[PDB]
Structures are given as C-alpha cells and as structure tokens.
Amino acid sequence: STQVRGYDFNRGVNYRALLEAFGTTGFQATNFGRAVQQVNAMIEKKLEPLSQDDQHADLTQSRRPLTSCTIFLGYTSNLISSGIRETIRYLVQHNMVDVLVTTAGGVEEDLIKCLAPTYLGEFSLRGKELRENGINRIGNLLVPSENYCKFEDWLMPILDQMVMEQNTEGVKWTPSKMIARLGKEINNPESVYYWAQKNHIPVFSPALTDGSLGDMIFFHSYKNPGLVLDIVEDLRLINTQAIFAKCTGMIILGGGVVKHHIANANLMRNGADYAVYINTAQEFDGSDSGARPDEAVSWGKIRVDAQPVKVYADASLVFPLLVAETFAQKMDAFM
Amino acid sequence: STQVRGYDFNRGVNYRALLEAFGTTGFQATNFGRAVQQVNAMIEKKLEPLSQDEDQHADLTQSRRPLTSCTIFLGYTSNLISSGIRETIRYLVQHNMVDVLVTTAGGVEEDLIKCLAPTYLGEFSLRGKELRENGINRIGNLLVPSENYCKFEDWLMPILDQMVMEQNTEGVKWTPSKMIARLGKEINNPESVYYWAQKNHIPVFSPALTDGSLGDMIFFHSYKNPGLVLDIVEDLRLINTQAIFAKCTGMIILGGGVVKHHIANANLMRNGADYAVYINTAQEFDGSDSGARPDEAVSWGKIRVDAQPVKVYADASLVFPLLVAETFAQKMDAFM
Amino acid sequence: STQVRGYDFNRGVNYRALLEAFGTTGFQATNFGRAVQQVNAMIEKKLEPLSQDDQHADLTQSRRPLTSCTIFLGYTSNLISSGIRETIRYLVQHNMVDVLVTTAGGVEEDLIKCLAPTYLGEFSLRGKELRENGINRIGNLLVPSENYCKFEDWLMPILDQMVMEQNTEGVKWTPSKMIARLGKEINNPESVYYWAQKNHIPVFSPALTDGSLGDMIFFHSYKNPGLVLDIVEDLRLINTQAIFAKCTGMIILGGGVVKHHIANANLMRNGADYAVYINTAQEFDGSDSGARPDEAVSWGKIRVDAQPVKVYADASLVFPLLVAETFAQKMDAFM
Amino acid sequence: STQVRGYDFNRGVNYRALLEAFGTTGFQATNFGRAVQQVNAMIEKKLEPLSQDEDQHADLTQSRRPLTSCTIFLGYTSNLISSGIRETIRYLVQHNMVDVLVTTAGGVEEDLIKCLAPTYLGEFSLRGKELRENGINRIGNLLVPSENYCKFEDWLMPILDQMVMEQNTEGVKWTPSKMIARLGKEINNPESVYYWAQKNHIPVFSPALTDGSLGDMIFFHSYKNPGLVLDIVEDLRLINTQAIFAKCTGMIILGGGVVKHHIANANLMRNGADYAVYINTAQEFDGSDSGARPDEAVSWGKIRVDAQPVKVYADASLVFPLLVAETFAQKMDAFM
Structure with a gap:
C-alpha cells in the first residue's frame, strides 16, 4: 500500500518531480497520475512492432497502416x-493518435483560427452588450462575428467544388470525407485538420451540421443545391477502425456525442483496452456525459480487465500536463 | 420588490400553493417559478390566433402541421x-403541445425498445463487471437487459430491408427525421413518443442518429443489404425552416450536448428564440456549450435580447413533471 | 425488480400521485422517492411508544424527553x-425533530427576518453596484445592509444582559445556550429559534462567531468586555443526545460543518439508523461536503445495516416536497 | 486584446513555458494564470518595505510576528x-510565506496524526461495510486506519491533562488557536504544519475545532478530568485584529465552508481584502457561500471593489502545487 505524500518544495522546483508527486497527493491529483500511467501503457503498446498485411485496408477501406x-x-x-487546439494539433501532426472524434464546432473553429484569432474575455460578460458589438462568447473566450464572415468567404468556393465533384465525379460525401477536404484546403500547419488528412487520420463528427459549418452549408444549398452528407458510410468506417484493431485506447476530453460515439465503436470489439476520460460532468443526472468509465464496462465498451481512469478536471488545465508526461516524452519514438 | 417567503405547512398540504411558493423561496426554487412563468407565456402565445399577416408568413411552411402563434x-x-420522463414527453407530443423534437440516437431507440421490453431501477454504484457477466447494461441508476436489444434487432431488420428497397426502387431520399417518423409508424404503440410524433406531424431531428444501438443495427444490416443513405443536409434545411417561418419560438431544453446546441442554432436563423427554459446540471466553468448560461446564447443571437430566459440547475427527472403539471397540463382542454 | 415508468398526465393532475411516481422515474427522482421512504421510516420509529425514566435527563443534562x-x-x-426557513420553522414549531445543527449565518438570518425581509434578486448582479447601494448578495437573494443595523440595535442590550448574568449569576455561556436566549428574546412565531427554545430543541453551531453575529459580539466586547462562549460543553450536550438515543436519524441539507458535526456525534453510538442528505456537492475533490453516505459508513457514523439516501438537488426545490410527503402527512400524530 | 494560443510541444517540454501558456489557453487554465499573477502581486507587496507611517499602524498589533506590507x-x-497538499502548506508555513491559517478541526488533527502514522491511497468506490469491518476509514480516495486515532489518543490525553491543570492553577484561558499552537509545540516534528506555525508565530484559527476526532478525545477526557474551556470569542478578536491593522491583505482559500467564510468575514473589518484567490469545485447555483463567486464577497465589502479576485474551478490537489511552484517557490530566497 502506498502512502500519501506531496511534493516537498524544500527540494526546490523540479517540474518533472512535481508532476510525478501528483500520484501520491490524492484526490484528482492521484487520478492524474493514474492517467499518465494508462496513456503511457497505450503508447508503449502502440510502439510494439507487429506483423500483418492489404487485407486490413480492404475491410477498413483505409490507407492508414495498422499499429499494435x-x-x-x-x-x-x-x-x-481554447489553446488545447495547439495540444491536439501537436499529437495529430506527429501521427500519435489514429482516429479523431469531435463536434461540428470542433471542426470549424480550428479552420477559422487560421483566418482570424479567438480572444480572451470573461464568463461574466453580458450577452446584450456583446451582441451589440458583434462579439460572440464561448466560456471566457470571445470570437468576433466577422470571423464567420471570413469563414463564409473561404468556404463557399469549396462547397461549389464539392457539389460539382459529387454530381459528375461520383463522390459520395460524408462528414469525415468533408473534414479531410477542408483540412487539405486550409493548407496551414497550425490546423488540426490539415495535419489529420496529411497523416491519414480520419475525423468523425456525425452531427457536423450542428454549427456554423451547418449554417454555411444551409445558405450555400439555396445558391447551389445538391450537397448530400451521408452518415451511414462514416459509421462503417469508424466501426471498422475498432473491429480490426489489435488493441484500442480511448482518450476522451469532455462529454456528449464524442464520448458516446467512440465508446460505441469499441463495443464492436467488446471493449477498449485502455481508457482515459477528462471532464467535469457528473453522474447523478444519469447522462452519458457524466457516467464513470465503469458504466461503459457494464456495456462492454471497456473491457472488464481494463483499468480505466477518469480525471474530474477542466481539460484546459490537465491535458497539456498529461501530454507533457506521456506523448511528448516519446517524440523520438514517433520519428 | 419581492420578499423571500416559503410555503407555510401550517396551512396544510395545498399542493398548488406549495408549487406556487417556489417562486419566492429562492435559489433554484425561484428559477423553477420563473420557468413556469416562461413556459406559460409560450403556451399563452401559442394559443393566440394568427392575424392575417401572421398566417400568411407561417403558411410558407410546406409542412402539414397546423401553424400556430x-x-x-x-x-x-x-x-x-x-427514465420515466419518457412518459412526460410522450404526453406532450400526443396532445400536440410541442412542435419539433430534438434528441440524440439513444433518445429514439430507447423509446421504441420500451414498447418491446421494460427498463428497470438499479443503483449508480453497481459494478460493471458483474453486470456485464449477467448481460445487464447500466444507465445511471437504471438497468436494461441485453435481450432488449435482441428484440430490437428482430423488430428493426425487416424495416431496414424495406427502407433500402424504397430507396432503390421508389426514389426515397432518407434522412434521420424521415427514418424516425417511419420507425414511429412501425412501432404502432400509443406508449411511444415517436408513434405520436409521426401521427401528429411533429418532426424529430437527431443529426447523430447513427451513434448508438440503431447505428449498430444499420451497420450490421449494411453488410447483408448495403447502400442505405441517411442525409443530414436535408434535415438541416427542414429544422431551420421550422424556425425561420415561425411567428414566435420557444425552446424547452432538457440536458446539454447536440440537442441544446442544435435547437439554439436553428433559432439563430430568426435572430433568436422569444422564450427559453433550460433544465440541466451542467456547469459553465469548463466553457462547454452544455454548461453555458442562456446569456451566452444571447451573445450569439440564439436567444433574443428582450427575452427573459431561465435556466433551472436541477436533474430534469425531478423538475420536468412538476413544470408540466403547472403549465401544459393546466391547459389540456385547449389542446384537444 | 421494479420497472421504470413516469407519471401519466392523461390521468390529469393529482399531485400526490405525481410525487409518488418519482420513485419509478429514475435518477434523482428515484432517490427522492427513496428519501420519502427513509424519512417516513424515521417518523414511524419516532412515534413508537417507549418506556424509560430522570436518568436520561441527568446524563444528557436536557429537559427534552426521549422518544423512540x-x-x-x-x-x-x-x-x-431562503424560504426553506419557513419549512424548517414548521418542523421545529411542531416538535417533529429533536436537535438542530446550522452555521452562524443560519442563526442570525432567522432572527433578522423578524426585523426586516430578504428580497429576490439574481445571481448575475455585480458586487460593485450592489455595494454602492448598500445591498448584499446571497445567491439570487438580497439583504439590505440596514438589516444588520436593525439587528445590531436589537442585539446590543441582550449582550449586555448576557455579560451581566455571566459575571454575577454564574451563567457559563455556550453557542446553544446563546441561541436559545436569542430565540426567547426575538419572541416571534415566525422564527425557527423562538420555536426551538420553546420546545426544548437545542441548536448546535460551534462556529457561531463566523458571521454577523460574530461581528456584533466583537464590536460589543470593546464596549462591554467579558463574554465567553465555550464550545466544550456544547460538545458534551450534542454527543449525549446521540449516545442515549434509542434510534437516530439524520436529515442533512447542504455540507460543511453541519454535515460533519451531526455525523460525528452519531459515531459515538457507532452510527445513525436512518440518514438523508440533500445537497449539490460532489465527491471528486475528497471533501466531506461532497462525500456519499457510504463514506460515513466506513467510519461508523451510519450503521452498516442502514439504507441511507443522498438526493443530488438544491434543497430549496426538494425539501418542501419531502416535507409535504412525510412530516406534514403525520401532523395529527404530532398533536 | 490577448489572443488564445496553447503551448506548442514542437518546442519541447519546457515546463515553465508550458505553465505560463495556461494564461492564454482559456477556461480554467486562464484563471490559473490569473491566480499566479494575483498571488505574485501579493508576494511583491509583502516584500515591499513599510514606510514609517505604515510601520506605525501595523505595529499596533500586539502580536510577535514581524509585520509586513x-x-x-x-x-x-x-x-x-x-492529501499531499499537507506537504505544500507545511512548506509555506515553514518559510513564513503566509501569516494566518484558517482550517476546520479535521485540518488540525490529521496533520498531527500524520506524524504518528501515515495515510494511504485508496479508491472513492471502496464500500463502507467491508472497510468498517477491517477498521479502515475512507476520506475520498484516501484511507486512514482506526489505529491511527488510537495512537492519537495515547499522544493527546497527557496534553489535555496538562492544559486543564494550567487552566485551573495558572489561570490559562484556552482558545482554539492557543490549543493548536500548543499541540504544534508538543508534536515537535518538522513534517507538521502546526509545529511550524507555532514556531513562526503564525496563528491558526478553527472556530469548530471540536467537530472531529480532537473533539471526541476532549469529550472522553472531560469525564475523567472535567472543566476544559475553549473560548471562541477571544479568537474572534485575535483574527479580526490581524486584518484590521494590516497594511494590505491577501486571501488564498482552498475549498469552501467555514474557512472560506471566516477569512472573508475577518477582511470585511478592513472594508475588504486587496488580493484574493479561491480554488474549489463548489458551484454557485444552490446559493451556498462555498460555491459563491468572489464577486459575491465584493457585494459585502469582504473583497475591495478595485481588487481583481480570481476563482479557479479545480480540485486544489492538482492546482495548488503548480500555483506554489510559479509564485512562492520562485522567491524562496527572499523569505529566508
């Protein structure tokens, strides 16, 4: 049995030792330490050599090579x-994860940041005055409305090409296919989705229309009717990523559809081997967002022998620390 | 200037008086009272007749549903x-008291499956290992047997066969809302929310319909019978049109996630909902949309500036039946 | 096993049936139903006749007769x-509970409401403007500063008498003794503490000085030095209430010291027989406020055979409903 | 106008740069950055010298502790x-980096008991029955053997005997803070927070000191040796005097409850703290003082209007060691 003991600042300030001490500090600091261990277990399993074949690509319909x-x-x-955009972009840029799942806001806000920035503000700011000045609030962040005007100008010509390619080149569009195209077009190394498509990391977002991107597509469809986005083919693509995996891990930041969609794909292989959740949601209202990992075990979305971890924390604080002690330590092994 | 005072039980258990007294009790009890006022304002507006001019603009809807104010x-x-709130929602849909539903995939199939097999009471603390071993799945403090989904598979597969056939031979262009209407017709059971929604021409939107057990079944099905397409773009036009050609809009949103965002974003298209009540336990401090206060939506134009939206920070399983009791259920005669 | 089913409004609106249906509705509604049952178990046990003696009073040093x-x-x-002041006053007025535990704000705000009201406001109101207008915010409630001026005027002459009685009539003051005296002085049937002292229900508040009452006592002590408030004797009084009980139940609204103090007194009898918590606190930071009842079982503050219930809810919503279905149903049995 | 940008790990793991980047990352990461700025402002003020006039007013303190700015x-x-934050708190107290401690009863005795026997890591989910049967008590995901408290009984009883004797024969008028100072002297262990507090003349206030294991022991003791009095009125004068005759005040408050309220109410006596950082996970919507935003304290005069207080919504076990690393620990030389 391990004793509780916090970091002793009489040693001075060594950050690596400070972060290691979280494991024995208790409460969510201990869960953070447990999360470092689970993610490092994922990475070490991923780096094990493997031997397998063209077969993989035919049943997943993916160019991405399998790993362990x-x-x-x-x-x-x-x-x-938030700035966790940079953290996620880093992992995708260096091919450290294999599948992304987000919501539609989570696609378009990465693309818009390549056109214009998001600013710091405060949770307290009143919507009336913000709206009168053309500013939209996201937590304690602020996005000028003009950002979406620039986004519209950038996007309309691409939508025109997508409709044309659909009606004459046979393209059957899905959200993931669309997200790849947008990342290719933004052509900017600051963008998560630019790196994802370059590295053949698919992005699933079955509610992609539920945001500003949706808005644009809607307005565009009256100037250029025709665009269809199918979600059934994306279901086959994500589920096959899970079925034909040697092992799977889930790193899930927040709740909602991103949490559920990833968990349900892993129910196809009767469970993920590793799992970390980072969120502030609570179980007591019965929502999937607030459920402990152990609920997912009852479903088989996480294997009974797994040691899943939830850190009850704002991921803006915890995720960069987690990456610092896990993925960023093994950068040499990813090149 | 309104004074704080709680219900005085020296008066006896006068339930209506006790509920009305929440308004002056403070904290979330006052927010409940405000939510009752906001929803009654939505209902009073809904029952007000359309002038000639208002009728002209609302009829632009190519939908069958009678337009209201x-x-x-x-x-x-x-x-x-x-949960048992399925019962509350079904009642409102049955009596045409709401006009558009938005939910998540689970929110469709669990209503249908409840017409095949029940859900049971459990405890949050039950461990996943022993549950999985006995083929029980946990949803909060509720429990669903795996057998439930088998029954659902046997029920759904044939319908999937027919939908592919109608897609391929009759030109049907399926979307989530059209599939949900169809599944409601098939279930043909008055305990079902979606049975009543399709009967009453109330569309159901669920852009992430594939993310659950229904998706599992579509996925398996697609191998013995491929080609099913579910287009989300057409559904986006359909929900947005419901908001654009409304004389007035109200939002009643239970919980967070895509349902919260999708309804509010549809109302951005008319420069804001006139009335809105949120009921959920999500917190704002991580910047989630689920935990945002209504006043964030005001920033975006999703709720009008002159609106007086209300968030009740509570588990809807407690609040929503009380809200309905004090609002819609008091006007049942006006809806039949 | 019980099936999930909510109330069917096709029956119309019967509130008693509506509240009963919470038990089968799930999530916190089910826990509410479980709480109704636990409190009704407490009340039914309390109403059982008993046979015992003067002995009781000598080891508790209380005039309150024992019940079952x-x-x-x-x-x-x-x-x-909040308006839960009226709910609590009702229970105390009719002798339905035996011991009260609160914080200091929880004493003085009952007394002040007999001099001037608290008003409704909003959580959003900015402290700068409120302070400039002499208004203090409590959640979405508002108390004018003048309320505390009226409180000061009312209280100073009583403090003078308490110091005099201490230094010449031997009175050894404690918070509970003081709270009884203040309830006697306010002499107003709207006050919780007026009813508590009339019915011999003791009030424990070991941090009584941590509020406006504390302020007043502080200022008074430079005009009239001498007042001592001992917490050791109040410890003996509350613990003996628990030790010499036939059975005990705990109804605890919120967290903090009120939650802990009651739980620790019941650790003296190796646990409470019934227990209901109503609060919105969460466990994940390890605080006593957010702990589930099952933590208290590990300590012996709740008996292993008990079936304690936590309802995760604002008590302003849930407590009046709980009282309506429990204590208020048995009013005839309390007279 | 400050842009959102996160730390770029293409730069390598530069830990100081990573922590500084929280300020522009958003949500609670930005609040952490603001908390670092607020605490560094407290420290910079503390190290500024007292003018003659300022020295005159602060010396009015009849306390031994050197007064600072x-x-x-x-x-x-x-x-x-x-938790291991005991370690963080002890370091600050050891090096005279804070001036007044406020805690709850458990917050005193668990430091002393850790000098007799350790606390262990567990899990939140461990069931109370099997723990109780094996004489293990649970504190979140931490575990304390019952034996720990037995060791504490054997250690404390003699001291209680002496305090009663000094009360009765030497005229000692005990209060919570005086008892805590005495227990710190007795433990005589440099791992203890309260050892260092009494060595450095840092008073410890705990009005509800009786509400825990220490109270249990006082309670039992009072039967073989009655009469111990712990007066809370004198301690109220003592904490309030610390605030009234301060040149400037800062509050660093971890968690809610009496500690939060008692510190803030002491600062009402000077018409407000100049600096304040709250770290806790409590929510405002039930109207608790624990969950109130700092701006509520502004309403009361507990925090000055011109202050820029900061609440970080996080478990302090994660945040507080990082905060200390970026603030107090960078100025260690100035405090020795």
Missing part, C-alpha cells in the same frame, strides 16, 4: 476554441 | 427517454 | 436566507 | 491536510 494499438482521441468543440 | 422546440438527452 | 427516534436536522445558512 | 490568510479544508 489504435488510439481514439475525442474532444468537444470548446477545447478547439 | 408559437412554435415550441422540445429537446432532451437520451437518458431522459430511459 | 432522535432526529438530527442540519442545514446551511443559505437555506435560512 | 501584506498579511496573507491561507485557508483550507480538512481533506487537503489528509
């Missing part, structure tokens, strides 16, 4: 509005 | 359909 | 600022 | 003393 552990990373839109 | 969007998370 | 179940009711100050 | 109140709940 397929890592699903899911995150809510607000985290793409 | 207030189009009410009801959104709820899947857990509430697993 | 001693009910401890604890609540945080904010609930005395 | 900023009196810092550190408050924390009992659970944090059970």
Whole structure:
C-alpha cells in the first residue's frame, strides 16, 4: 500500500518531480497520475512492432497502416476554441493518435483560427452588450462575428467544388470525407485538420451540421443545391477502425456525442483496452456525459480487465500536463 | 420588490400553493417559478390566433402541421427517454403541445425498445463487471437487459430491408427525421413518443442518429443489404425552416450536448428564440456549450435580447413533471 | 425488480400521485422517492411508544424527553436566507425533530427576518453596484445592509444582559445556550429559534462567531468586555443526545460543518439508523461536503445495516416536497 | 486584446513555458494564470518595505510576528491536510510565506496524526461495510486506519491533562488557536504544519475545532478530568485584529465552508481584502457561500471593489502545487 505524500518544495522546483508527486497527493491529483500511467501503457503498446498485411485496408477501406494499438482521441468543440487546439494539433501532426472524434464546432473553429484569432474575455460578460458589438462568447473566450464572415468567404468556393465533384465525379460525401477536404484546403500547419488528412487520420463528427459549418452549408444549398452528407458510410468506417484493431485506447476530453460515439465503436470489439476520460460532468443526472468509465464496462465498451481512469478536471488545465508526461516524452519514438 | 417567503405547512398540504411558493423561496426554487412563468407565456402565445399577416408568413411552411402563434422546440438527452420522463414527453407530443423534437440516437431507440421490453431501477454504484457477466447494461441508476436489444434487432431488420428497397426502387431520399417518423409508424404503440410524433406531424431531428444501438443495427444490416443513405443536409434545411417561418419560438431544453446546441442554432436563423427554459446540471466553468448560461446564447443571437430566459440547475427527472403539471397540463382542454 | 415508468398526465393532475411516481422515474427522482421512504421510516420509529425514566435527563443534562427516534436536522445558512426557513420553522414549531445543527449565518438570518425581509434578486448582479447601494448578495437573494443595523440595535442590550448574568449569576455561556436566549428574546412565531427554545430543541453551531453575529459580539466586547462562549460543553450536550438515543436519524441539507458535526456525534453510538442528505456537492475533490453516505459508513457514523439516501438537488426545490410527503402527512400524530 | 494560443510541444517540454501558456489557453487554465499573477502581486507587496507611517499602524498589533506590507490568510479544508497538499502548506508555513491559517478541526488533527502514522491511497468506490469491518476509514480516495486515532489518543490525553491543570492553577484561558499552537509545540516534528506555525508565530484559527476526532478525545477526557474551556470569542478578536491593522491583505482559500467564510468575514473589518484567490469545485447555483463567486464577497465589502479576485474551478490537489511552484517557490530566497 502506498502512502500519501506531496511534493516537498524544500527540494526546490523540479517540474518533472512535481508532476510525478501528483500520484501520491490524492484526490484528482492521484487520478492524474493514474492517467499518465494508462496513456503511457497505450503508447508503449502502440510502439510494439507487429506483423500483418492489404487485407486490413480492404475491410477498413483505409490507407492508414495498422499499429499494435489504435488510439481514439475525442474532444468537444470548446477545447478547439481554447489553446488545447495547439495540444491536439501537436499529437495529430506527429501521427500519435489514429482516429479523431469531435463536434461540428470542433471542426470549424480550428479552420477559422487560421483566418482570424479567438480572444480572451470573461464568463461574466453580458450577452446584450456583446451582441451589440458583434462579439460572440464561448466560456471566457470571445470570437468576433466577422470571423464567420471570413469563414463564409473561404468556404463557399469549396462547397461549389464539392457539389460539382459529387454530381459528375461520383463522390459520395460524408462528414469525415468533408473534414479531410477542408483540412487539405486550409493548407496551414497550425490546423488540426490539415495535419489529420496529411497523416491519414480520419475525423468523425456525425452531427457536423450542428454549427456554423451547418449554417454555411444551409445558405450555400439555396445558391447551389445538391450537397448530400451521408452518415451511414462514416459509421462503417469508424466501426471498422475498432473491429480490426489489435488493441484500442480511448482518450476522451469532455462529454456528449464524442464520448458516446467512440465508446460505441469499441463495443464492436467488446471493449477498449485502455481508457482515459477528462471532464467535469457528473453522474447523478444519469447522462452519458457524466457516467464513470465503469458504466461503459457494464456495456462492454471497456473491457472488464481494463483499468480505466477518469480525471474530474477542466481539460484546459490537465491535458497539456498529461501530454507533457506521456506523448511528448516519446517524440523520438514517433520519428 | 419581492420578499423571500416559503410555503407555510401550517396551512396544510395545498399542493398548488406549495408549487406556487417556489417562486419566492429562492435559489433554484425561484428559477423553477420563473420557468413556469416562461413556459406559460409560450403556451399563452401559442394559443393566440394568427392575424392575417401572421398566417400568411407561417403558411410558407410546406409542412402539414397546423401553424400556430408559437412554435415550441422540445429537446432532451437520451437518458431522459430511459427514465420515466419518457412518459412526460410522450404526453406532450400526443396532445400536440410541442412542435419539433430534438434528441440524440439513444433518445429514439430507447423509446421504441420500451414498447418491446421494460427498463428497470438499479443503483449508480453497481459494478460493471458483474453486470456485464449477467448481460445487464447500466444507465445511471437504471438497468436494461441485453435481450432488449435482441428484440430490437428482430423488430428493426425487416424495416431496414424495406427502407433500402424504397430507396432503390421508389426514389426515397432518407434522412434521420424521415427514418424516425417511419420507425414511429412501425412501432404502432400509443406508449411511444415517436408513434405520436409521426401521427401528429411533429418532426424529430437527431443529426447523430447513427451513434448508438440503431447505428449498430444499420451497420450490421449494411453488410447483408448495403447502400442505405441517411442525409443530414436535408434535415438541416427542414429544422431551420421550422424556425425561420415561425411567428414566435420557444425552446424547452432538457440536458446539454447536440440537442441544446442544435435547437439554439436553428433559432439563430430568426435572430433568436422569444422564450427559453433550460433544465440541466451542467456547469459553465469548463466553457462547454452544455454548461453555458442562456446569456451566452444571447451573445450569439440564439436567444433574443428582450427575452427573459431561465435556466433551472436541477436533474430534469425531478423538475420536468412538476413544470408540466403547472403549465401544459393546466391547459389540456385547449389542446384537444 | 421494479420497472421504470413516469407519471401519466392523461390521468390529469393529482399531485400526490405525481410525487409518488418519482420513485419509478429514475435518477434523482428515484432517490427522492427513496428519501420519502427513509424519512417516513424515521417518523414511524419516532412515534413508537417507549418506556424509560430522570436518568436520561441527568446524563444528557436536557429537559427534552426521549422518544423512540432522535432526529438530527442540519442545514446551511443559505437555506435560512431562503424560504426553506419557513419549512424548517414548521418542523421545529411542531416538535417533529429533536436537535438542530446550522452555521452562524443560519442563526442570525432567522432572527433578522423578524426585523426586516430578504428580497429576490439574481445571481448575475455585480458586487460593485450592489455595494454602492448598500445591498448584499446571497445567491439570487438580497439583504439590505440596514438589516444588520436593525439587528445590531436589537442585539446590543441582550449582550449586555448576557455579560451581566455571566459575571454575577454564574451563567457559563455556550453557542446553544446563546441561541436559545436569542430565540426567547426575538419572541416571534415566525422564527425557527423562538420555536426551538420553546420546545426544548437545542441548536448546535460551534462556529457561531463566523458571521454577523460574530461581528456584533466583537464590536460589543470593546464596549462591554467579558463574554465567553465555550464550545466544550456544547460538545458534551450534542454527543449525549446521540449516545442515549434509542434510534437516530439524520436529515442533512447542504455540507460543511453541519454535515460533519451531526455525523460525528452519531459515531459515538457507532452510527445513525436512518440518514438523508440533500445537497449539490460532489465527491471528486475528497471533501466531506461532497462525500456519499457510504463514506460515513466506513467510519461508523451510519450503521452498516442502514439504507441511507443522498438526493443530488438544491434543497430549496426538494425539501418542501419531502416535507409535504412525510412530516406534514403525520401532523395529527404530532398533536 | 490577448489572443488564445496553447503551448506548442514542437518546442519541447519546457515546463515553465508550458505553465505560463495556461494564461492564454482559456477556461480554467486562464484563471490559473490569473491566480499566479494575483498571488505574485501579493508576494511583491509583502516584500515591499513599510514606510514609517505604515510601520506605525501595523505595529499596533500586539502580536510577535514581524509585520509586513501584506498579511496573507491561507485557508483550507480538512481533506487537503489528509492529501499531499499537507506537504505544500507545511512548506509555506515553514518559510513564513503566509501569516494566518484558517482550517476546520479535521485540518488540525490529521496533520498531527500524520506524524504518528501515515495515510494511504485508496479508491472513492471502496464500500463502507467491508472497510468498517477491517477498521479502515475512507476520506475520498484516501484511507486512514482506526489505529491511527488510537495512537492519537495515547499522544493527546497527557496534553489535555496538562492544559486543564494550567487552566485551573495558572489561570490559562484556552482558545482554539492557543490549543493548536500548543499541540504544534508538543508534536515537535518538522513534517507538521502546526509545529511550524507555532514556531513562526503564525496563528491558526478553527472556530469548530471540536467537530472531529480532537473533539471526541476532549469529550472522553472531560469525564475523567472535567472543566476544559475553549473560548471562541477571544479568537474572534485575535483574527479580526490581524486584518484590521494590516497594511494590505491577501486571501488564498482552498475549498469552501467555514474557512472560506471566516477569512472573508475577518477582511470585511478592513472594508475588504486587496488580493484574493479561491480554488474549489463548489458551484454557485444552490446559493451556498462555498460555491459563491468572489464577486459575491465584493457585494459585502469582504473583497475591495478595485481588487481583481480570481476563482479557479479545480480540485486544489492538482492546482495548488503548480500555483506554489510559479509564485512562492520562485522567491524562496527572499523569505529566508
């Protein structure tokens, strides 16, 4: 049995030792330490050599090579509005995860940040005055409305090409296919989705129309009717990523559809081997967002022998620390 | 200037008086009282007749549903359909008291499956290992046997066969809302929310319909019978049109996530809902949309500036039946 | 096994049936139903006749007669600022509970409401403007500063008498003794503490000085030095209420010291027989406020065979409903 | 106008840069950055010298502690003393970096008991029955053997005997803070927070000191040796005087409850703290003082209007060591 003991600042300030001490500090600090261990277990399993074949690509319909552990990373839109956008972009840029799952805000806000920035503000700011000045609030963040005007100008010509390619080149569009195209078009190394499509990391977002991107598509469809986005084919693509995995881990930031969609794909292989949740949602109202990992065990979305971890924390604080002690330590092994 | 005072039980248990007294009790009790006022304002507006000019603009809807002076969007998370709030929602839909539903995938199939097999009471603390071993799945403090989903598979597969056939031979262009209407017709059971929704021409939107057991079944089905397409773009036009050509709109949103965002974003298209009540336990401090106060939506134009929206920070399983008792259920005669 | 089913409004509106249906509705509605049952179990045990003696009074040093179940009711100050003040006053007026535990705000705000009201406001109101207008915010409630001026005028002459009685009539003051005296002085049937002292229900508040009452005592002590408030004797009084109980129940609204103090007194009898918590606090930071009842079982503050219930809810909503279906149904049996 | 940008790990793991980048990351990460700025402002003020006039007013304190330009109140709940944050708090107290402590009863005795026997890591989910049967008590995901309290009984009883004797024969008028100072002297262990507090003349206030294991022991003791009095009125004068004759005040408050309220109410006596940082997970919507935003305290005059207080919505076990690393620990040389 391990004793409780916090970091002793009489040693001075060594950050690596400070973070290691979280494991024995208790409460959510201990769960953070447990999360470092689970993610490092995922990474070490991923780095094990493997031997397998063209077969894989025919049943997944993916160009992505299999590894010894397929890592699903899911995150809510607000985290793409935050600086965790840079954290996620880093992992995708270096091919450290295999599948992304977000909400529609979580696609478009990455793209818009390549056109214009998001600013710091305060939770307290009143909507009346903000609206009168053309500013939209996201938590304690602020996005000028003009940001979406620039987004519209950038996007309309691409939508025109997508409709044309659909009606004459046979393209059957889905959200993931669309997200890849937008990342290719934004063509900017600051963008998560630019790196994802370059590295053949698919992005699933079955509610992609539920945001500003949806708005644009709606307005565009009266100037250029025709665009269809199918969600059934994306279901086959994400589920096959899970079924034909050697091992799977889930890193899930926040709740909602991103949490559920990743968990349900792993129910196809009767469960994920590793799982970390980081969110502030609570169980007591029965919502999937607030459920402990152990609920997902009852369903088989996480294997009974797994040691899943939830850290009850704002991921804006915890996720960069987690990456610092896990993925960022093994950068040499990813090149 | 309104003074704080609680209900005095020296008067006896006068239930209506006790509920009315929440308004002056403070904290979330006062917010409940404000939510009752906001929903009654939605209902009073809804029953007001359309002038000639208003009728002209609302008829632009190519939908069969009679247009009213207030189009009410009801959104709820899947857990509430697993709960007994399924019963509350079904009643409102049965009597045409709301006009548009928004939910998540689980929120469709658990209503249908409850017409095949029940959900049971459990405890939050039950461990996943022993439950999984006995083929019981946990939803909060509720429990659903795996057998339930088998029954659902046997029921749904044939319908999936027919939908593919109608897609391919009759030109049907399926969307989530059209599939949900169809599944409601098939279930053909007056205990079902979606049975009543399709009977009463109340559309159901669920852009992430594939993310659950229904998706599992579509996925398996697609291998013995491929090609089913569910387009989300057409549904986006359909929900947005409900908001654009409304004389007035109200939002009643239970929980967070896509249901909260999708309803509010549809109302951005008319420069804001006139009335809105949120009921949920999510907190704002992580910047989630689920935990945002209504005043954030005001920032965006999703709720009008002159509106007086209300958030009640409570589990809807407690609050929503009380809210309905004090609002819609008092005007039942006006809806039949 | 019980099926989930909510109330069917096709029956019309019968509130008693509506509340009963919470038990089968799920999530916190089910826990509410479980709480109704636990409190009704407490009340039914309390109403069982008993046979015992003067002995009791000598080891508790209390005039309160023993019953078959001693009910401890604890609540945080904010609930005395709310209308739950009326709910609590009703239970105390009719001798339905045996021991009260609150914080200091929870004493003085009951007394002040007999001099001037608390008003409705909003959580959003900014402190700068409120302070400039002499208004203090409590959640979405508002208390003018003048309220505390009236309180000061009312209280100073009583403090003078208490110091005099201490230094010449031997009175050894404690918080509970003081709270009884203040309830006697306010002499107003709207006051919780007026009814508590009339019915010999003791009020424990070991941090009584941590509020406006504390302020006043502080200022008074420079005009009239001498007042001592001992907490050791109040410890003996509350613990003996628990030790010499036939059975005990705890109804605890909110967290903090009120939750802990009641639970620790019941650790003296190796546990309470019935227990209901109503609060919105969460466990994940390890605080006693957010702990589930099952933590208290590990300590022996609740008996292993008990079936304690926590309702995760604002007590301003839930407590009047709970009382309506429990204590208020048995009013005839309390007269 | 400050843009949102996160730390770019393409730069490597530069820990100081990563922590500084929280300020522009958003949500609670930005609040952490603001908390670092507020605490560094407290520290910079504290190290500024007292002018002649300022020295004159602060010396009015009849306390031994050297007065500084900023009196810092550190408050924390009992659970944090059970956690490894005990280690963080002890360091600050050891090096005279704070001036007044406020805690709850558990917050005193668990520090002393850790000098007799350790606390262990557990899980939140461990069931109370099997723990009780094996004489293990649960504190969140931490575990304390019952034996710990037996060791504490054997250690404390003799001291209680002496305090009664000094009360009765030497005229000692005991209060919670005086008892805590005495228990710190007795423990005589440099791992103990209260050892260092009494060594450095840092008073500890705990009006509800009786509400826990220490109270249990006082209670039992009072039967073989009655009469111990702990007066809370004198301690009220003592904490209030620390605030009234301060040149400047800062509050660092971890968690809610009496510690939060008592520190803030002491600062009402000077018409407000100049600096304040709250770290806790409590929510405002039930109207609790624990969950109130700092701006509520502004309403009361507990925090000055011109202050820029900060609440970080996080478990302090995560945040507080990071905060200390970026503030107090960078100025260690100035405090020795």
